[PDB]
Amino acid sequence: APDVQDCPECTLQENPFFSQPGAPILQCMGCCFSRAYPTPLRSKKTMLVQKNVTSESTCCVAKSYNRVTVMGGFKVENHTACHCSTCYYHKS
Ligand SMILES: *[C@@H]1O[C@H](CO)[C@@H](O[C@@H]2O[C@H](CO)[C@@H](O[C@@H]3O[C@H](CO[C@H]4O[C@H](CO)[C@@H](O)[C@H](O)[C@@H]4O[C@@H]4O[C@H](CO)[C@@H](O[C@@H]5O[C@H](CO)[C@H](O)[C@H](O)[C@H]5O)[C@H](O)[C@H]4NC(C)=O)[C@@H](O)[C@H](O[C@H]4O[C@H](CO)[C@@H](O)[C@H](O)[C@@H]4O[C@@H]4O[C@H](CO)[C@@H](O[C@@H]5O[C@H](CO)[C@H](O)[C@H](O)[C@H]5O)[C@H](O)[C@H]4NC(C)=O)[C@@H]3O)[C@H](O)[C@H]2NC(C)=O)[C@H](O)[C@H]1NC(C)=O
Predict the structure, then answer these.
(1) Which residues are glycosylated?
(2) DSSP single-letter state for residue 73
(3) I need a labelling partner for 6 at 20 to 30 A (CA). Which of 31, 34, 64, 92 fits?
């Protein structure tokens, strides 16, 4: 029985606008699973519909973008290297 496509991994959602005959822009999808190494923590503003969107962790911010501002100024940081994790700094 068909339905959906589940939730792959945090990648790039190739710009469905800039996607021209030679330039397939992007904009990091966002679905790097929801692994829970230690005890799941919270408290960071968020406060969004708790519908399977609170457990997930890590964060992906195009490790290396190639931004191609489109439309009225659509930024896709033409993701050249999306990395889901390192959502902060240690030691420091
Ligand atoms: C927004 O951001 C996007 C990315 O997030 C960006 O798009 C991405 O751009 C990247 C480039 O900047 C691109 O990466 C490159 O991919 C090349 C391969 O592309 C093909 O495969 C991929 C993967 O499957 C596919 O997606 C892509 O469409 C290509 O598919 C082929 O396309 C053909 C038409 O173009 C098509 O037609 C023919 O088909 C034939 C039969 O199959 C055959 O394949 C023909 O070749 C082909 O033309 C073909 O069918 C199809 N094939 C398939 C599988 O479908 C890589 O080649 C390229 O690598 C090189 O560059 C990178 C970056 O610099 C280097 O890191 C890497 O090392 C390579 O560098 C050179 O490598 C050669 C290797 O030989 C070196 O040569 C040496 O030569 C010596 C002497 O002979 C000796 O032999 C040595 O051994 C050799 O090494 C050379 O020295 C190296 N140069 C240097 C300087 O070091 C690179 O990885 C990526 O794929 C894009 N991503 C996407 C989603 O498309 C987008 O552009 C951005 N947007 C904007 C607006 O900016």
Answers:
(1) 52, 78
(2) T
(3) 64
Ligand 1 centre to CA of 29 (Å) is 22
How many C-beta neighbours within 10 Å does residue 19 have?
A: 13
Q: How far apart are CA 6 and CA 31, in angstroms?
A: 10
How many angstroms separate the alpha carbon of residue 44 from the centre of ligand 1? Answer: 40
Domains of the chain (ranges, CATH numbers):
1-92 (2.10.90.10)
Instruction: Tell me, letter by letter, the H, E, C secondary structure of 1-20.
Output: CCCCCCCCCCCCCCCCCCCE
Angle at 48 between CA 40 and CA 57, to 5 degrees: 30
Residue that the structure tokens 């501002």 belong to: 69
Query: Which experimental technique did the depositors report for determining this structure?
Result: NMR
